[PDB]
Subunit: 237 residues, 6 copies
């Protein structure tokens, strides 16, 4: 057991899907995993382990923000033998060509957090995904008929930013999605020697846009999770 | 409703107690509040409203880390008419004279987060509590026979810090407790014109120490919550 | 003697009031202290010691700016047995509701200086006053019929600021007054293990217009000094 | 013509290979391109254009360092219709498992430069390659029987580093190679809307000893260039 | 009249010598000038105007630290038509071969203050003296047969520095003397369009606590003042 | 031999002139030296040793940017006994009264590079030329009847800057010319214990795109080279 995960070595798979919302983790275990077992309830951060087409997989919430996901991803890697982390989340879009419900794969993650500067003697650490995990996700997406965009995320510390003009800078430099975690997760992965990917679904456009139905949101969420789960299987080959 | 709180104006009191763990919020509502009603379940971030000696009070989890609590505290202030936030949490101690189970009241909060630099044109924002809220808490504590320490907290972005030497610096400059929120909460309070306090209970000593029993932990947790609730009543006079 | 104070252990009380202006130190000694003797004149930075209602008290100028007041407060603390510093100064207001001749007590002090960053490994140190000293001052002011405002000061390095967009930021984040010392003094106090407080009168409204008073000013100035001295008596018990 | 390239629209292919050394640009043109013509000689920064298996391709030196390669890559992109830049360089290894003559592909590039901070409002920009270009390179290398390592480079401003404690940090965080350009090139590509990739061969092991090879070196260098050119053909479809 | 100088346009010469100590400004007025009249005593910051071999010259204390001297130098430039400022101060040596009582001429000034960063968008402003003023002081010192070193001062905010290791860095980079003003004065001269120079004499070693007497200290204090005044005469031709 | 210079101890003079363009190093060797022999051509960075009125003098390109010239200047100092470096380059003007073809002498160099911050614990290192070298160049220019301004250069990392507003700041603070090297050269000279100066001629205005011809540009290019070489002769006496 670790201070935030009441479990023991072997309760988690070597791959963990992590949505921000622990209620989404439960949904994932019910909908996609066979023979599922609850492995964590500390602080209501529900975590599960089961199988997907024979492959042992875990899914657990990480909570909002770099500091929250940095705790869980760290403890998973150092105490539970976890090798790959796939964040499966939502993000806001700044580019007009990026649409609601697009699947974005974060090969890199910009951030306004200081955590990687603390790690890296105040220089620029390029917070990146594991490349094979990126390609696995792109290929899984293509096999399912979904055309994912690959590029930079921006991991924001402040959801309610006082710096509105920063969204124009994000747009200018090609940022595909704004979320709150990737750069933190990629930093932990590099610190402790494991591998990470963040896949996000565009749930907001910080420009116009219109909005979507609950049936549409569920479909793309399911698509994202299919992409994550199938990407793991490609990775094992 | 706000993107993280499915509720409407008047569902929350103008004062909200916020532990990090939403399961502790439920415990608080059951143990101390009368006529309690659940007002939030979005992402499992359980929130409640009831009364304590006649006074309308709410209690809701904020999750770990500045970015998480910054979302909830912001939405509470701007959309739910909340005026005072009392964080009620745990912290690690660096000073040898500060003991397990001490109640620490954060008149200020140091941080290694960048959020207040983003707010404050990269200068030093002294993240502080509201003074009356501090004194209310000190007086409530004294009336209950608990002798609280008042001073600086340190709000860390990284629970698992790669910068071990920073704990010696914290010790040198008098930091009473290490937690993950206060500076963020105090920043939001200043940004949006409300008032905040963080009270913490020492649950770890990052030096020796020994440890405690579950009965002892529950007692001091209850003491902290009594201090928070009674402080509110002094504040209304 | 230290390189900036030509005096010996015992020549100062264990509490020192400190205006910026050494001429105002003489004003204070002469007006409020009995049996007042001059104890320093190096660089014209007049210091005095006498009694206020039987209690040994010193008053000495600190000069303008963090680097100046950091020298004097340090040497007082480490070489003259001084345990409490009370800065008694002027400040400029940025908030509309803060008026000329309001007494403001600096519970915390923001700054654009780098001194606390140098001390605190480039993180945010919340430069705060001693809590008991703050509440002694509030109570001493209440006994005199004055309602002191307690909150954040801003300690500026540049009196003539290159750009005044920073005043709008100070105003947004609730800064009560702008002066040039508090954050430095609170830093020294934490570095060297003593207690400090800054009390200021509002001399100027940098916002507006700036409609003026008489003197009047001088009676409000005397009220600040009386608050300081009476707060010391409260602190003694 | 631009201030650093004496050539006209059409003189370059829409893809440019770029070594640091202009003498190596001539090596590449001469060895790998048919019908190769020199298209630039301003400041001795030789550029050439010819064909590789019927495909129009250019190769031109960029000089050592971010500021040098930022000039050439920008002018190529905005004035010569260039859509893809492939840096083909050397780098120093810090990881034990990374050997002399490993081909490393810079999916991301860390840096101690300030150029991306200047672009990105002092936040962390993750300087990344174009994903498709990265996977074209990996596949081109696999077809040639080479197992390219994909990960982070470090783009240093100081070849002769003031202190080498930074190499241990690079090693802890999984940096595959140290060179002087990639982060700058990836920044320009994102600023001006083009695509870029850095491929390097390991010329040195800054860690150890550093036991040596023959040339051999030169055949691994030719493999890098063949990977680059073949990746372009894959990218064309 | 300005907020810190009770005097009028004409009371000061167009050149002002400024020691930190106002009492040394007095000694200079007594010892070197004739028809010396006091033109300022606000806050005890004594200023004098007189003549040196018939040349109108002023001399006024600036207080300790960047913020203090920035106030007085600014006011002198904007409201009293002062064109040139010559600081005549003490400094500490960090180089073993710079001996007590050496005269140092600050052609540049390093600093750990943030004031020039605030002026210069957080980039490196090289805080430099006026070249002709530097040349004049080198020639005045030659003509009087006095040894004088030209190079970098370091202007510190903390006389009592918590970072002793920084002195090794100053040593490493050839810093001739550590004082508390020059970089601030040179930034003010640049901002408000005047000219400045800092001359200092080494009154101790940071490393040691080495010994002299009141005969030599004043004769060397007098050497610096002669250089300064004679350098002005040369500037006039 | 060093990694970027194929030559041996003795092949260079103790003084080296360095333009950025190696082809201008060639023109200088042809036009001004006698018995000129090529001593370096690695990476095409042409270096020549010869004599000027019997004085042994070398001249070698340094490439564009701080990182490039830091490599070559370091190697020259540590392995070829070079004592003095004189950069002879072009710059852009930001002051309207600094005209095309003006000669500028960089007594100091501002920068937006991080290299000196890395050397100087993130404080402000005033990057300065050697005073005697500056004096020699002022006197050489006087004796040849050439106008020459002394003050601050700004050494930029981005020739193509995304922050146009910074040019207004450079203007505000008297920056005489914008180039890409001086601050880096002056930092190298300080770190490795040699002497340096940067002289430049203004080849355009950042603001405008103003016009000249090949007759005047070379005659002014020649003016700067004469100053540099004659300044060395003066230094020898
Ligand atoms: N900052 C930010 N984070 C987001 C957005 N959408 C999703 N995330 C990341 O999820 C955490 C917030 O619910 C957005 O629009 N902005
Ligand atoms: N960084 C840190 N945060 C703590 C500690 N104890 C409590 N907190 C704050 O609570 C969030 C982590 O569970 C501690 O020891 N270190
Ligand atoms: N920076 C600043 N300092 C002040 C102000 N008012 C008083 N002080 C303190 O400086 C005292 C010297 O005038 C103000 O408006 N700004
Ligand atoms: N900074 C750095 N650059 C390198 C290294 N190896 C190759 N390069 C790229 O510089 C090419 C010029 O030698 C290295 O070990 N460090
Ligand atoms: N910071 C610093 N300043 C000095 C020293 N010596 C002289 N000065 C100049 O100002 C300090 C006045 O006491 C020193 O040793 N350190
Ligand atoms: N950054 C910059 N450098 C210049 C300019 N003019 C000359 N230099 C010196 O190096 C640039 C060579 O093209 C300019 O306008 N900007």
């Amino acid at each position: 057991a670790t201070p935030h995960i009441n479990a023991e070595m072997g309760d988690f798979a070597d791959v963990v899907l992590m949505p921000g919302d622990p209620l989404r983790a439960k949904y994932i275990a019910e909908t996609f995993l066979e023979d599922a077992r609850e492995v964590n309830n500390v602080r209501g951060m529900l975590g599960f382990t089961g199988t997907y087409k024979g492959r042992k997989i875990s899914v657990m919430g990480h909570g909002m923000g770099i500091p929250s996901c940095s705790i869980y991803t760290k403890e998973l890697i150092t105490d539970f033998g976890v090798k790959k982390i796939i964040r499966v989340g939502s993000c806001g879009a700044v580019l007009p060509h990026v649409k609601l419900r697009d699947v974005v794969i974060g090969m890199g993650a910009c951030t306004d957090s200081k955590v990687n500067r603390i790690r890296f003697k105040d220089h620029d650490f390029a917070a990146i995904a594991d490349f094979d995990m990126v390609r696995n996700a792109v290929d899984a997406a293509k096999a399912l008929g979904i055309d994912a965009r690959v590029g930079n995320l921006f991991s924001a510390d402040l959801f309610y930013s006082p710096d509105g003009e920063m969204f124009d800078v994000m747009e200018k430099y090609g940022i595909l999605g704004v979320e709150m975690e990737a750069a933190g997760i990629y930093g932990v992965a590099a610190e402790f020697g494991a591998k990470a990917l963040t896949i996000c679904t565009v749930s907001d456009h910080i420009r116009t846009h219109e909005q979507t139905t609950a049936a549409e949101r569920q479909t793309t969420f399911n698509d994202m999770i299919k992409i994550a789960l199938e990407s793991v299987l490609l990775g094992d080959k």
